[PDB]
């Protein structure tokens, strides 16, 4: 794998030991061969798990999730997928790594797709080697892969709302269950229904992931209610997965707005990853997987692939050359390479709206390409009345940086900025000039 000009896909089934057994061997061989190496973790939680598997080896942890004293002798760097892409975008030299290892290379967040595209392009140019580690590489059609111990698979109707009757099998269980819901708001409803029935419930989402995951190891629980983020290496000591088989999909309508379509079916890769949370202990057979719908190829036309092209168009590769998306996932978006290339000043605004503003890639691009500077928030208030953001069925209001009370009515509307109370609270602070 380690020889130049080659991309290898390590596709062992979930729980086969890619992180704790294969990754340390790869690191030893890379250090022995003097290969400048990068290890890319999907999340801060996986970076902490990787430090345990690589403990002792000279690895430089470029993350605050690990508290380790770096000796300065390391030729192997470990960072999150998003940190890699962020450093590529920023005015900072990123080493031209001889070996690029990506754990959970199935992650479909825009910054993961862009990291895959940049790395595979370097490999295609014969400049580097790469290893993409995932049980479900792009193109997988098998939602029931192998496991360490047998799994009971059962197609059943799964609640997506609070219930008074008809689902005895859910509460009549004395083990631990991980439940994948289509959204944060749907998770809040089921969590409230299970809590009222006497259950201890922990909720996980992208924004609360590091803090709340700790509680799964630190306290006794009956149910973990989570969005699709737990498909990225999150491990639990559970005997059952309940899977709605549904997700929300960001969709760009007419190139003018982003809506959250669905809930709609997950891909076969997502279903296999959600199922993959159980059946991991060979000494505990009989873990259950209850699924409530079929799979579909819902990544086609999904906004993350267009957003990944917006990231790659603004990453320097060599002169005017632009990195292409990783070949098995390049048809998920109809886009010309270079069409989102911004000039130096607007590109700096684009990065800052993402990094500091915490805005979605699509929304940051609309603001920056319009020649608006980072601190100029007038666009948050001058959109059409149909772009009015609503809070509890009444128009949301903020005090502007000028001391005037205005209705939140963005010029460009992206449903991700108000999809839940936490997201809307953060967008209100942005519109007020608080960050
Ligand atoms: C720089 C990069 C591409 C890694 C990034 N950072 C933060 C955010 C986003 N992207 C998009 C989602 N919103 C926050």
Swiss-Prot record:
PTM note: Acetylated by host KAT5. Acetylation modulates NS3 RNA-binding and unwinding activities and plays an important positive role for viral replication.
Membrane protein topology class: Peripheral membrane protein
Motif (DEAH box): 103-106
Region (Important for RNA-binding): 3-6
Binding site for ATP: 12-19
Lumenal side: 1-435
Site (described: Involved in NS3 ATPase and RTPase activities): 274, 277
Segments forming domain Helicase C-terminal: 150-329
Compartment(s): Host cytoplasm; Host endoplasmic reticulum membrane
Modified residues (N6-acetyllysine): 207
Domain Helicase ATP-binding residue range list: 1-155
Assembly behavior: Forms a heterodimer with NS2B. Interacts with NS4B. Interacts with unphosphorylated RNA-directed RNA polymerase NS5; this interaction stimulates RNA-directed RNA polymerase NS5 guanylyltransferase activity. Interacts with non-structural protein 2A. Interacts with host SHFL; this interaction promotes NS3 degradation via a lysosome-dependent pathway. Interacts with host CEP63; this interaction disorganizes the centrosome and inhibits host innate immune response.
Function description: Displays three enzymatic activities: serine protease, NTPase and RNA helicase. NS3 serine protease, in association with NS2B, performs its autocleavage and cleaves the polyprotein at dibasic sites in the cytoplasm: C-prM, NS2A-NS2B, NS2B-NS3, NS3-NS4A, NS4A-2K and NS4B-NS5. NS3 RNA helicase binds RNA and unwinds dsRNA in the 3' to 5' direction. Leads to translation arrest when expressed ex vivo. Disrupts host centrosome organization in a CEP63-dependent manner to degrade host TBK1 and inhibits innate immune response. Inhibits the integrated stress response (ISR) in the infected cell.
Name of the protein described by the UniProt record: Serine protease NS3
UniProt organism field: Zika virus
Full-protein positions shown: 1681 to 2115 of 3419
């Amino acid at each position: 794998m380690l020889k130049k000009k080659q991309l290898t896909v390590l596709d062992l089934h979930p729980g086969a030991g890619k992180t704790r057994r294969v990754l340390p061997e790869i690191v030893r061989e890379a250090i022995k061969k003097r290969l400048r190496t990068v290890i890319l973790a999907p999340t801060r939680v996986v970076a902490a798990e990787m430090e345990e598997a690589l403990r002792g080896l000279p690895v430089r942890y470029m993350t605050t999730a690990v508290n380790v004293t770096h000796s300065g002798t390391e030729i192997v760097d470990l960072m999150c997928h998003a940190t890699f892409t962020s450093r590529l975008l920023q005015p900072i030299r990123v080493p031209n790594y001889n070996l690029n290892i990506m754990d959970e290379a199935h992650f479909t967040d825009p910054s993961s797709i862009a990291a895959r595209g940049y790395i595979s392009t370097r490999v295609e140019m014969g400049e580097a080697a790469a290893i993409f580690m995932t049980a479900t590489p792009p193109g997988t059609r098998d939602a029931f892969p192998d496991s360490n111990s047998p799994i009971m698979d059962t197609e059943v109707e799964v609640p997506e709302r609070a219930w008074s009757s008809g689902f005895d099998w859910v509460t009549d269980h004395s083990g631990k269950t991980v439940w994948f819901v289509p959204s944060v708001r749907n998770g809040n409803e089921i969590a409230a229904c299970l809590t009222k029935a006497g259950k201890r419930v922990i909720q996980l989402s992208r924004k609360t992931f590091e803090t709340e995951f700790q509680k799964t190891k630190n306290q006794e629980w009956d149910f973990v209610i989570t969005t699709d983020i737990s498909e990225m290496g999150a491990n639990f000591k559970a005997d059952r997965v309940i899977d709605s088989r549904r997700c929300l999909k960001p969709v760009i309508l007419d190139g003018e707005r982003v809506i959250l379509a669905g809930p709609m079916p997950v891909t076969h890769a997502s279903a296999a990853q959600r199922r993959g949370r159980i059946g991991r202990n060979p000494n505990k057979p009989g873990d259950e997987y209850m699924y409530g719908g079929g799979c579909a190829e819902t990544d086609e036309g999904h906004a993350h692939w267009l957003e990944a092209r917006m990231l790659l168009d603004n990453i320097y590769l060599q002169d005017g050359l632009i990195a292409s998306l990783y070949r098995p996932e390049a048809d998920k978006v109809a886009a010309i390479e270079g069409e989102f290339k911004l000039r130096t000043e607007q590109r700096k605004t684009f990065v800052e709206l993402m990094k500091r503003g915490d805005l979605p890639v699509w929304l940051a691009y609309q603001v920056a390409s319009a020649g608006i500077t980072y601190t100029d928030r007038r666009w948050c208030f001058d959109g059409t009345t149909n772009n009015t953001i609503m809070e509890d069925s009444v128009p949301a209001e903020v005090w502007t940086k000028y001391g005037e009370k205005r209705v939140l009515k963005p010029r460009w509307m992206d449903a991700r900025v108000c999809s839940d109370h936490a997201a809307l609270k953060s967008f209100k602070e942005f519109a007020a000039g608080k960050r």
